[PDB]
């Protein structure tokens, strides 16, 4: 087996969000838990400033902030799915950020049955203890003191077993806990006092009280009100011993309330969210009782507006609320004083992409660009969507002037009054051409005082309203307004300029080994410094940074012999840090630049290597040497902002944008074959565009959003289920299901317009293959009826061309696009099942063959089957399908019909169907993997092997005829090999705790492809897209050693060792990780410091640190 | 153990032995109320009363 698995897209679904002061006592923070990731932000008037993002070795189950005695800022408590408790402290020392572990420990019991309502963790107001509820009838308490480092906690025997929700009650003498529990009698609210000394539950403040049969939420009300609020389906009650206030408003019965958050510290207002995606305001009215303390007057509920389906909510400040969603896009909303015409105080501000739940997906090379694209069935209910994900950063080309051999580009402004650029100077071999930009027109013009028979190295707008031009012959200065040469510096011995660089106010040129520092002043260029170097100059840069914003105090340079990057002071040339470089290749380019706040020195070489180091603007010394290869030809480094952030463009064989995110440099490729030179441009006809140039053509065009992976969202406003592509018709087939309420008039009416209703063409599945007398339709008013549908969405515009609705109670479960038999037409075949609420098992279903012709989906064939069709696949020109526990193979006859060719009756339900050649891997929801094979001479199926281990299963895929990848219970991945003697059983050869629930596997890759065997992408419920590629044993054996060596040096968050986290876990079985390599762990080898690499790479084949750099870099190219 | 059958006894379940007077039954067990004893006639094995058969 031996498989390698890496994350192509991090999980996007939000499962927890809190507000506090984690970074600083003054900074209001927002922490977000994206499953195995933690995001840290700061609340500002604009929005959220990203500060840090860390990789947690576990699914974050609980996330809470607290500040005990003798603590300047909030500490973060986090508990993972594998019960790993931790107290994390934020510590920023200068421009470097670090998350350190104050205390850590595993709180998993020896023997315990996990509770039905998951894990519930809560903290006491005075930060005296942490109350966890991991198992049924057992309430664990961690003693919060400045001494418990290992987190040794005690378990208490709780008589109540079925506890729904529990919160530490505010305003109490001792640490009290309020909770709602269920028993055979009914749901009730109870209180207990938690004593650390005695370790037992003493009587609480008030007696046990009865609550609604559908009451399932507890809110710890802070001072001065106190007590708790119990939310249910119809009633909302308050409990403070003596007082029992209750209201049943009609505005809340439409949907179940699922989340809550506090707005005021006192607790006068609370935001509530429901399943239908509504936002409400729960107002605790306060009566002014003259005895100091106040009493609750009445509870009032108000509808604010419509938001995404929120798992958790959080009020930030000034009406700004963050909406953390699991189903749809997480969003940032604003609550206004005055509501809009529709009557909604909620107004969206920003939308954060969420690809999950990825229920289905396919790989299609949509633009035939060589690189594949991924279209996914994302979201559910009103949050239904289709997302197209592709690697790289696009370039929207507008101009295309054929000018071969350009050796430099520079934007210019001939007129000072205009802020926009109207000139673009191009350099050529021994010559310089100048172009004019009158809108979209480009004409060859001559700028005064600019020599044209010499090759230019730099030119542009400079201080005192002047223009500069550094040529092989000499440096020129032209007065912008009268257009004339005013000053010209020449070399004393009439020598040519070898290398040169200039900025807004300074000019630094070099002739072989000589160097001359010049300054820009009205009509003059005066030489200040004159220094000779050890060897000939290779490259130069003088980009100023945010030290003083005027003239740069430091300068970067490179040498021909004894290659090294050096930093120099301008009024003297003092050698600050001489970082020596290795190899027999000279640095072609060098650049100083700012990124977020920290400054960096980037140095490129002829072999395509790029070094980057942190550089302090006052001291002038380098730090953290990190090397990375991008291309094979020399790289050119230029700067551009585009969307309010400085970015660097690296022109080479593999052009790439070096940008920053999470205070570290990111290297995302641009979708262009080759760029030799480029510059940013901002003309009237080309606003905020980029001027790229290659071996043959000058091109002007707008860049895409600067980020790894470009995602396009198509909203449907209904749940998508399956997707397949039909190349002949240039469109996708998508199964969908809107929810229509049962009308009193005897019909259906949607809650909102969606893709299936708002379509160009629509049709109903008028058919009588199912008789009317099957099951009596006894659904009352307001019942949720699921109206299934098939959409013919276009592949270029993604517009819904057709929406064929199925029959009443019909459920579409499978869909394929293929040519069957000797028929040249490609069809859309759908497997359905008749689901009547009264019937438990589906005894009816059908298979419909469709043909999208003349803009209308025609029905070709309709085969009724006695059972549900869960999966179908194309098998050697014959349609293979699954009816309940029967794997049937159909033949497409000349009279366009599906005749039954062969049958195979199995003692397991057929949910999954995958094929490779003549092999058929069937599967079940209870991990019943079964490999069958169709012998053509026999004319029927034959079992080869099986492995029926009882375990939940979500997806399956065939890597090759022997290896079979699959996803199983408690977020794990497994592989089944075939030993083709004993052949009738599959050998399990892979175990790996992924931490994500895989809904779908799909063969393909998102790389251009102009090292590893095979390529399988996977879509998870948390919006994470992963990749599995199989590898050799020699390569596995090497990378397995790297896994053990990297764990010794990488400082894990919460000190959780990698071996335990990625090891298999299904409660009863907890085996180590085998037959799998965590690619994300391997990829972090480049992120560690240079001395750490020497410790990792400690010990024919020799270890060498640089050798393993190329192997790890090769593995990053597969995703 | 010879033991000859003297009166016809029809079996009421799969545990009792269907008998016809004349045959000798090899006595396997000889303990029970009303002389109910276990026996085998080569193939079939089952119980029978003493007031029907004789030693």
């Amino acid at each position: 087996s031996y498989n390698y698995v890496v994350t192509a897209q991090k999980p996007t679904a939000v499962n927890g969000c809190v507000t506090g002061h984690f970074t600083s006592a003054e900074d209001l923070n927002l922490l977000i838990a994206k499953n195995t990731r933690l995001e840290i932000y700061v609340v500002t008037a604009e929005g959220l400033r990203p500060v840090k993002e860390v990789g947690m070795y576990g699914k974050i189950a609980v996330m809470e902030l607290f500040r005990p005695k003798g603590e300047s800022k909030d500490l973060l408590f986090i508990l993972t799915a594998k019960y790993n408790a931790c107290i994390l402290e934020y510590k920023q020392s200068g421009e470097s950020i670090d998350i350190i572990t104050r205390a850590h420990g595993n709180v998993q019991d020896r023997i315990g049955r996990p509770s039905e309502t998951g894990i519930i963790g809560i903290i006491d107001p005075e930060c005296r203890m942490i109350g966890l509820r991991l198992y049924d009838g057992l309430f664990k308490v961690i003693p919060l003191d400045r001494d418990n480092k290992e987190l040794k906690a005690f378990n208490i025997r709780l008589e109540e077993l079925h506890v729904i929700d529990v919160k530490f009650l505010y305003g109490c003498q001792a640490p009290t806990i309020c909770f709602v529990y269920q028993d055979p009698q009914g749901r009730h609210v109870k209180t207990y006092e938690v004593s650390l000394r005695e370790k037992e539950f003493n009587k609480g403040p008030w007696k046990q009280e009865n609550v609604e049969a559908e009451a399932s939420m507890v809110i710890a009300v802070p001072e001065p009100f106190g007590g708790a609020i119990i939310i249910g389906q119809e009633s909302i009650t308050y409990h403070n011993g003596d007082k029992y206030l209750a209201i049943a408003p009609p505005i809340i019965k439409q949907s179940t309330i699922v989340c809550h958050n506090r707005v005021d510290p006192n607790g006068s207002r609370y935001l509530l969210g429901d399943m239908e995606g509504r936002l409400f305001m729960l107002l605790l009215e306060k009566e002014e009782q003259m005895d100091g303390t106040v009493t609750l007057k009445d509870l009032r509920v108000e509808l604010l507006g419509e938001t995404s389906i929120a798992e958790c909510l959080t009020y930030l400040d000034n009406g700004v609320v963050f909406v953390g969603s699991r189903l749809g896009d997480s969003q940032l909303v604003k609550l206004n004083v005055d509501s809009n015409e529709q009557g909604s105080y909620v107004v969206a501000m920003e939308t954060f992409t969420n690809l999950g739940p990825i229920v289905d997906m396919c790989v299609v090379d949509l633009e035939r660009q060589g690189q594949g694209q991924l279209v996914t069935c994302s979201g559910a209910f009103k949050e239904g969507s289709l997302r197209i994900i592709r690697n790289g950063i696009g370039i929207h080309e507008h101009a295309s002037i054929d000018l071969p051999g350009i050796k430099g580009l520079w934007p210019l402004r001939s007129d000072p009054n205009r802020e926009t650029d109207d000139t673009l100077v191009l350099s050529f071999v021994g010559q310089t051409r100048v172009l004019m930009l009158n809108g979209e027109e480009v004409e060859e013009t001559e700028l005064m005082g600019f020599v044209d028979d010499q090759q230019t190295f730099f030119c542009g707008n400079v201080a005192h309203q002047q223009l500069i031009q550094i040529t092989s012959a000499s440096v020129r200065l032209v007065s912008q307004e009268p257009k004339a040469l005013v000053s010209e510096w020449k070399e004393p011995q009439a020598k040519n300029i070898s290398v040169a660089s200039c900025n807004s106010s300074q000019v630094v040129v070099a002739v072989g080994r000589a160097l001359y520092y010049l300054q820009i002043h009205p009509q003059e260029l005066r030489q200040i410094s004159h220094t000779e170097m050890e060897h000939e100059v290779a490259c130069l840069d003088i980009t100023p940074l945010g030290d003083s914003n005027g003239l740069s105090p430091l300068c970067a340079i490179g040498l021909w012999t004894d290659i090294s990057a050096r930093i120099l002071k301008l009024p003297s040339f003092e050698l600050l840090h001489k970082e020596m470089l290795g190899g027999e290749i000279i640095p072609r380019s060098i650049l100083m630049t700012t990124f977020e706040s920290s400054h960096y020195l980037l140095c490129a070489l002829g072999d395509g290597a790029l070094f980057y180091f942190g550089l302090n603007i006052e001291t002038g010394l380098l730090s953290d040497r990190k090397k990375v290869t991008l291309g094979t030809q020399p790289t050119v480094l230029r700067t551009f902002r585009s969307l309010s952030t400085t970015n660097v463009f690296a022109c080479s064989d593999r052009p790439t944008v070096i940008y920053s995110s999470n205070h570290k440099l990111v290297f995302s490729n641009v979708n262009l074959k080759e760029v030799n030179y480029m510059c940013p441009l901002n003309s009237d006809g080309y606003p905020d565009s980029l001027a790229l140039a290659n071996n043959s053509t000058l091109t002007i065009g707008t860049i895409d959003e600067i980020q790894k992976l470009h995602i396009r969202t198509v909203p449907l406003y209904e749940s998508p289920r399956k997707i397949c592509y039909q190349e002949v018709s240039q469109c996708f087939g998508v199964l969908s299901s809107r929810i229509e309420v049962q009308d009193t008039s005897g019909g259906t009416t949607a809650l909102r317009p969606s893709a299936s209703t708002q379509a160009l063409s629509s049709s109903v599945s008028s058919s009588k293959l199912f008789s009317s007398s099957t099951a009596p339709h006894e659904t009352s008013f307001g019942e949720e009826v699921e109206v299934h549908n098939l959409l013919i969405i276009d592949q270029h515009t993604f517009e819904v061309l057709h929406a064929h609705q199925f029959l009443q109670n019909e459920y579409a479960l499978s869909l394929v696009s293929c040519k069957l038999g000797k028929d040249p037409n490609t069809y859309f075949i759908v497997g359905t099942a008749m689901v009547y609420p009264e019937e438990a098992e589906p005894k009816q279903g059908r298979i419909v063959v469709f043909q999208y012709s003349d803009g209308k989906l025609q029905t070709v064939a309709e085969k009724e089957v006695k059972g549900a069709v869960y999966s179908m696949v194309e098998f050697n020109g014959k349609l293979l399908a699954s009816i309940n526990s029967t794997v049937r193979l159909y033949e497409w006859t000349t009279e366009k019909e599906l005749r039954t060719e062969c049958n195979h009756y199995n003692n397991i339900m057929a949910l999954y169907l995958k094929t490779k050649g003549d092999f058929i891997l069937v599967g079940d929801l209870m991990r019943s993997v079964l490999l069958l094979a169709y012998k053509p001479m026999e004319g029927n199926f034959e079992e080869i092997a099986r492995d029926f281990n009882p375990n939940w299963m979500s997806a399956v895929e065939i890597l090759d005829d022997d290896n079979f990848l699959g996803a199983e219970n408690a977020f794990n991945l497994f592989v089944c090999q075939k030993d083709s003697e004993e052949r009738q059983h599959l050998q399990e050869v892979g175990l790996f705790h992924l931490g994500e629930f895989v809904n779908v596997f799909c063969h393909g890759s998102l790389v251009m492809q102009n090292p590893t065997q095979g390529s399988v992408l996977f879509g998870t419920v948390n919006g994470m897209i992963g990749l599995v590629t199989s590898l050799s044993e020699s390569w596995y054996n090497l990378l397995l050693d790297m896994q053990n060596r990297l764990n010794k040096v990488i400082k894990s968050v919460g000190k959780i060792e990698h071996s335990f986290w990625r090891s298999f876990h299904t409660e009863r079985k907890t085996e180590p990780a085998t037959g799998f390599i965590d690619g994300d762990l391997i990829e972090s080898f480049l992120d560690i410091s240079r001395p750490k690499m020497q410790e990792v790479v400690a010990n024919k084949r020799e270890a060498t640190a640089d050798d393993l750099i190329k192997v790890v870099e090769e593995l990053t190219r597969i995703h | 153990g010879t033991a000859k059958a003297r009166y016809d006894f029809c079996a009421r379940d799969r545990s009792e032995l269907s008998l016809k007077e004349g045959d000798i039954i090899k006595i396997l067990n000889k303990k029970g109320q009303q002389g109910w004893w276990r026996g085998e006639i080569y193939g079939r094995v089952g119980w029978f009363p003493a007031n029907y058969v004789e030693e």
Partner: protein
């Protein structure tokens, strides 16, 4: 774990955990063996024979003796013993001792349990809304499925599909079939634990030896509940084991006169186990002899031997009331050891999971 546990020779039953094994031993060699099992508090084994002629077994259950009743009579010291199955096992070796009693080398099979299918999808979503108390049955089941399986839409399968694998829904589906036969409440009679519920159903279902062997081979309680429903829904006909095409009774005629399930374990005065199933009607059976009341398992009702119409094999007995005040007036007590659950039409035995 591994244990060399002893095996009784007279046992011919396929015992299921929780099911009671009645016994009546005449031989003093097995009586003394039973009494040693009392003092040492050890458990004996019940080998589920595939080929009972040459004594061949691959699986079984460890039975613990829970009752002993020495009845020192004039003839011989006759003993009556009740035992209960506890743990399922795999047979590794059959060590036949010089005393004619075999000591099977046993490997205890683990009781495989699985959590809620929705808990494996997400951790904190829809946790508060999961278990609910106790308006009509239709409205409770429609909202229970929509509220418990709300996470199902996040996966590649519908709500109703996961209902076919949920232990609570499968148990309730079985309870609806059981209530049609027996007029008893689940409250205390039937257990709430899916493991105990599955084994309780397995013991009281009228099924042949091979179905019980395959049912005992099942490890997960979820799979066992699904297989039990497949038998109830597909095998709606019971036929003679000898001639396999003689329809005797159907599912819709099963009832419980005794308030101890539809098919209970009874024993005749000769020490033989008869798992009698009570049915209102039973076609294709010949009645032999006169109606007797000697050692009547159902007092008041008179039994008459009921043999097959074709092969004349003993199938059961016809029970008719003597007093007119009784209700019902007639029923048939059919023995499990002679009934083959046949799927009607022309399809052979098949059962998903």
């Amino acid at each position: 774990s591994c244990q060399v546990i002893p095996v009784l020779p007279q046992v011919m039953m396929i015992l299921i955990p929780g099911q009671t094994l009645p016994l009546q031993l005449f031989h003093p060699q097995e009586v003394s063996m039973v009494r040693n099992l009392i003092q040492k508090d050890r458990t004996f084994a019940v080998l589920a024979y595939s080929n009972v002629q040459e004594r061949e077994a691959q699986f079984g259950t460890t039975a613990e003796i829970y009752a002993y009743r020495e009845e020192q009579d004039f003839g011989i010291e006759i003993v009556k013993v009740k035992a209960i199955g506890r743990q399922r096992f795999k047979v590794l070796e059959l060590r036949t001792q010089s005393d004619g009693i075999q000591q099977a080398k046993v490997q205890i099979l683990p009781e495989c349990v699985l959590p809620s299918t929705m808990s494996a999808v997400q951790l904190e979503s829809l946790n508060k809304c999961q278990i609910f108390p106790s308006q009509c049955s239709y409205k409770w089941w429609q909202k229970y499925q929509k509220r418990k399986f709300h996470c199902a839409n996040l996966t590649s399968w519908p709500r109703w599909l996961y209902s076919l694998y949920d232990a609570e829904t499968l148990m309730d589906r079985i309870k609806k079939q059981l209530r049609e036969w027996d007029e008893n409440l689940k409250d205390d009679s039937l257990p709430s634990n899916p493991i105990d519920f599955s084994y309780r159903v397995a013991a009281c279902l009228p099924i042949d030896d091979v179905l019980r062997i395959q049912l005992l081979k099942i490890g997960s309680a979820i799979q066992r509940l699904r297989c039990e429903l497949d038998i109830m829904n597909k095998c709606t006909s019971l036929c003679c084991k000898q001639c396999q095409e003689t329809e005797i009774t159907t599912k819709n005629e099963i009832f419980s006169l005794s308030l101890c399930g539809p098919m209970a374990a009874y024993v005749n005065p000769h020490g033989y186990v008869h798992e009698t199933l009570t049915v209102y009607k039973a076609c294709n059976l010949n009645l032999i002899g006169r109606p007797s009341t000697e050692h009547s398992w159902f007092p008041g009702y008179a039994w008459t031997v009921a043999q097959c119409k074709i092969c004349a094999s003993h199938i059961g007995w016809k029970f008719t009331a003597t007093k007119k005040d009784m209700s019902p007036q007639k029923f048939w007590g059919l023995t499990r050891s002679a009934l083959l659950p046949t799927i009607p039409d022309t399809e052979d035995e098949i059962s998903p999971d």
